Motif scaffolding. Structure first.
Motif, mmCIF file in Angstrom:
data_model
loop_
_atom_site.group_PDB
_atom_site.id
_atom_site.type_symbol
_atom_site.label_atom_id
_atom_site.label_comp_id
_atom_site.label_asym_id
_atom_site.label_seq_id
_atom_site.Cartn_x
_atom_site.Cartn_y
_atom_site.Cartn_z
ATOM 1 N N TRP A 1 -14.443 23.273 20.674
ATOM 2 C CA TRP A 1 -14.447 23.392 22.123
ATOM 3 C C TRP A 1 -15.173 24.654 22.556
ATOM 4 O O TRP A 1 -15.986 24.623 23.486
ATOM 5 C CB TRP A 1 -13.012 23.392 22.665
ATOM 6 C CG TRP A 1 -12.988 23.530 24.161
ATOM 7 C CD1 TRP A 1 -13.061 22.518 25.077
ATOM 8 C CD2 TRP A 1 -12.926 24.748 24.914
ATOM 9 N NE1 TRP A 1 -13.029 23.028 26.353
ATOM 10 C CE2 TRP A 1 -12.945 24.395 26.284
ATOM 11 C CE3 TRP A 1 -12.843 26.099 24.567
ATOM 12 C CZ2 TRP A 1 -12.908 25.350 27.310
ATOM 13 C CZ3 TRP A 1 -12.790 27.057 25.595
ATOM 14 C CH2 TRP A 1 -12.821 26.673 26.943
ATOM 15 N N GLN A 2 -14.899 25.774 21.881
ATOM 16 C CA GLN A 2 -15.525 27.041 22.243
ATOM 17 C C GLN A 2 -17.028 27.014 21.996
ATOM 18 O O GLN A 2 -17.791 27.595 22.771
ATOM 19 C CB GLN A 2 -14.887 28.192 21.464
ATOM 20 C CG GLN A 2 -13.398 28.378 21.734
ATOM 21 C CD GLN A 2 -12.491 27.543 20.815
ATOM 22 O OE1 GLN A 2 -12.920 26.552 20.205
ATOM 23 N NE2 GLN A 2 -11.228 27.962 20.703
ATOM 24 N N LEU B 1 -18.989 25.608 24.876
ATOM 25 C CA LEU B 1 -18.991 26.406 26.097
ATOM 26 C C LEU B 1 -20.155 27.391 26.066
ATOM 27 O O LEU B 1 -20.212 28.236 25.173
ATOM 28 C CB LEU B 1 -17.659 27.144 26.204
ATOM 29 C CG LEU B 1 -17.483 28.175 27.309
ATOM 30 C CD1 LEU B 1 -17.657 27.518 28.685
ATOM 31 C CD2 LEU B 1 -16.123 28.820 27.159
ATOM 32 N N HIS C 1 -1.426 28.738 32.183
ATOM 33 C CA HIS C 1 -2.209 28.316 31.028
ATOM 34 C C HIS C 1 -1.360 28.216 29.770
ATOM 35 O O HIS C 1 -1.670 27.410 28.884
ATOM 36 C CB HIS C 1 -3.363 29.283 30.782
ATOM 37 C CG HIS C 1 -4.323 29.362 31.917
ATOM 38 N ND1 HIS C 1 -4.931 28.244 32.444
ATOM 39 C CD2 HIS C 1 -4.777 30.416 32.634
ATOM 40 C CE1 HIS C 1 -5.725 28.605 33.440
ATOM 41 N NE2 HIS C 1 -5.660 29.918 33.568
ATOM 42 N N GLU D 1 -14.304 35.461 30.255
ATOM 43 C CA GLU D 1 -14.714 34.173 29.703
ATOM 44 C C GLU D 1 -13.851 33.052 30.284
ATOM 45 O O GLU D 1 -12.652 33.247 30.525
ATOM 46 C CB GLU D 1 -14.598 34.204 28.185
ATOM 47 C CG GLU D 1 -15.250 35.443 27.556
ATOM 48 C CD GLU D 1 -15.893 35.159 26.198
ATOM 49 O OE1 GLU D 1 -17.138 35.090 26.099
ATOM 50 O OE2 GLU D 1 -15.135 35.005 25.221
ATOM 51 N N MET E 1 -11.874 30.766 29.488
ATOM 52 C CA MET E 1 -10.971 30.174 28.513
ATOM 53 C C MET E 1 -9.612 30.849 28.593
ATOM 54 O O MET E 1 -9.499 32.007 28.987
ATOM 55 C CB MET E 1 -11.522 30.274 27.091
ATOM 56 C CG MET E 1 -11.750 31.683 26.600
ATOM 57 S SD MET E 1 -12.564 31.663 24.989
ATOM 58 C CE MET E 1 -14.138 30.963 25.377
ATOM 59 N N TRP E 2 -8.575 30.104 28.209
ATOM 60 C CA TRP E 2 -7.220 30.654 28.225
ATOM 61 C C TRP E 2 -7.133 31.957 27.453
ATOM 62 O O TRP E 2 -6.361 32.841 27.817
ATOM 63 C CB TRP E 2 -6.233 29.663 27.635
ATOM 64 C CG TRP E 2 -6.283 28.321 28.209
ATOM 65 C CD1 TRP E 2 -6.455 27.979 29.523
ATOM 66 C CD2 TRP E 2 -6.148 27.103 27.487
ATOM 67 N NE1 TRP E 2 -6.424 26.608 29.658
ATOM 68 C CE2 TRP E 2 -6.240 26.050 28.420
ATOM 69 C CE3 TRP E 2 -5.963 26.798 26.134
ATOM 70 C CZ2 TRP E 2 -6.151 24.714 28.043
ATOM 71 C CZ3 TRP E 2 -5.867 25.476 25.760
ATOM 72 C CH2 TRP E 2 -5.960 24.448 26.710
#
Ligand SMILES: C[n+]1cn([C@@H]2O[C@H](COP(=O)(O)OP(=O)(O)OP(=O)(O)O)[C@@H](O)[C@H]2O)c2nc(N)[nH]c(=O)c21
Length: 184
Positions: free
Chosen positions: A29-30, A33, A173, A72, A74-75
């Motif tokens: 997933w990262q 991104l 989150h 960033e 993201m969580w």
């Protein structure tokens, strides 16, 4: 000296970064991104916005994220890990009718610092383009700050023009990564 009004770009209060996500099962997933570019003026915002695809034209599985420079989308970021998001859930018919206007309004609420004293709790915003139904969300930095989160949600709901029949929720989150904490 020349009047600055004639020739200077209009600085924004924050420098913002636009990110793109393309779903690819080959990658984490990262790794899907990626940073597109950054801007810190009104003029550079519109130049970026006007040359990129509208959210409604993206392939399903893609996201845009607009976050303050240094955060960033993201969580795991330090300014997201304890926060959450005000979620707007759209049905399939709303991709045509609302998705792009809601997204641009969300972008303006961010760069225009539209949440008064609590605009410092804003981290950024995310639109998810999905076949089962698209999503727009504003991410804030501390899910326990009741006053900040509430006032952001209420202002957000009014700027989008949603009627009181609709109710939007706020989820931390940590809950997503493992219910609503607030509703307006
Ligand atoms: C926003 N985000 C998403 N993911 C991954 O992407 C997945 C899909 O999360 P999603 O945010 O893309 O929602 P979607 O509607 O596609 O999926 P759903 O809401 O579960 O139905 C998440 O379950 C995570 O595996 C994330 N993974 C990490 N590590 N950090 C993140 O911030 C993060």
């Amino acid at each position: 000296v020349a009047n600055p009004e004639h020739y200077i770009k209009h600085p924004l209060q924050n420098r913002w970064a636009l990110w793109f996500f393309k779903n690819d099962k080959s990658k984490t997933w990262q790794a899907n991104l990626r940073l597109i570019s950054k801007f810190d003026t009104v003029e550079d915002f519109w130049a970026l916005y006007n040359h990129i695809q509208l959210s409604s034209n993206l392939m399903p599985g893609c996201d845009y994220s607009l976050f303050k420079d240094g955060i960033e989308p993201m969580w795991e970021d330090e300014k997201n890990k304890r926060g959450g998001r005000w979620l707007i859930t759209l049905n399939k018919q709303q991709r045509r009718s609302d998705l792009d206007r809601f997204w641009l309004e969300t972008l303006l609420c961010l760069i225009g610092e539209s949440f008064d004293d609590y605009s410092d709790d804003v981290c950024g915003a995310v639109v998810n383009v999905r076949a089962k139904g698209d999503k727009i969300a504003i991410w804030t930095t501390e899910c326990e700050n009741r006053d900040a989160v509430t006032h952001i949600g209420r202002v957000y709901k009014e700027r989008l023009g949603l009627p009181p029949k609709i109710v939007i929720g706020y989820q931390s989150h940590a809950d997503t990564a493992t219910k609503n904490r607030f509703v307006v």
